[PDB]
């Protein structure tokens, strides 16, 4: 799986709700000894691929800033009732 992503400019509740009100959602890449990277993801693209059970098991590549970050899906915050993703934690493999 290859996910395209942008570095989030703005963080916090207001920024994050604005992302999701435009069919994106925040995510975080952390782990290793590099600083956490806060990213924004296209919602429908990721929701489609996380339907597959392979998404959560296999290593994924986040193309953020044109750079390939290999990651595993660590945690997902789902929307309480709707079939949507609020947030994903990625750990640098």
């Amino acid at each position: 799986f290859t996910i395209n992503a942008e570095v989030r400019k703005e963080q916090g509740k207001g920024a994050s709700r604005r992302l999701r009100a435009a069919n994106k959602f925040p995510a975080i890449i952390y782990g290793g000894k590099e600083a956490p990277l806060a990213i924004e993801l296209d919602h429908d693209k990721v929701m489609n691929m996380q339907a597959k059970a392979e998404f959560y098991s296999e290593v994924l590549t986040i193309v953020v800033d044109g750079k390939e970050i290999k990651v595993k899906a660590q945690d997902v915050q789902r929307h309480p009732y709707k079939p949507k993703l609020q947030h994903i934690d990625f750990v640098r493999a």
Partner: protein
């Protein structure tokens, strides 16, 4: 129908029912019936819905009830005035928030789970949705 075997106190403040649910994942079975709406589920409603889905599966698979009606609801008798103390406990409710998985089911096909939960949902005062166990 479900009711606490004991409680510390007989009567409970009305309270409010704000927020989203805890227990939003199918944690036990394969399939779940999730609350989309907010409200009260009475013990009678929980039972009615349980009997519906149970009869649909023809006593096959396994059913979990994730919600428990632990909130006593009082009522005043007819033709009594206001005040003179809090009314008597008449029934028990579970407070439901959006996202609350109400029932779960395992050991049936999805098709039959969807039908069983559709029959159960018609007994409930809250809008529900079918959900499946997620890998994460």
């Amino acid at each position: 129908m479900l009711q606490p075997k004991r409680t510390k106190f007989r009567k409970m403040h009305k309270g409010r029912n704000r927020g989203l649910a805890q227990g939003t994942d199918v944690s036990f079975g394969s399939f779940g019936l999730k609350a989309v709406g907010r409200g009260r589920l009475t013990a009678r409603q929980i039972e009615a819905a349980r009997r519906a889905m149970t009869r649909a599966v023809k006593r096959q698979g396994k059913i979990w009830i994730r919600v428990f009606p632990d909130k006593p609801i009082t009522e005043k008798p007819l033709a009594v005035r206001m005040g003179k103390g809090k009314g008597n406990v008449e029934y028990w409710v579970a407070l439901i928030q959006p996202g609350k998985v109400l029932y779960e089911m395992d050991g049936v096909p999805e098709e039959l789970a969807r039908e069983a939960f559709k029959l159960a949902a018609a007994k409930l005062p809250i809008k529900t949705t079918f959900v499946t166990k997620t890998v994460m």
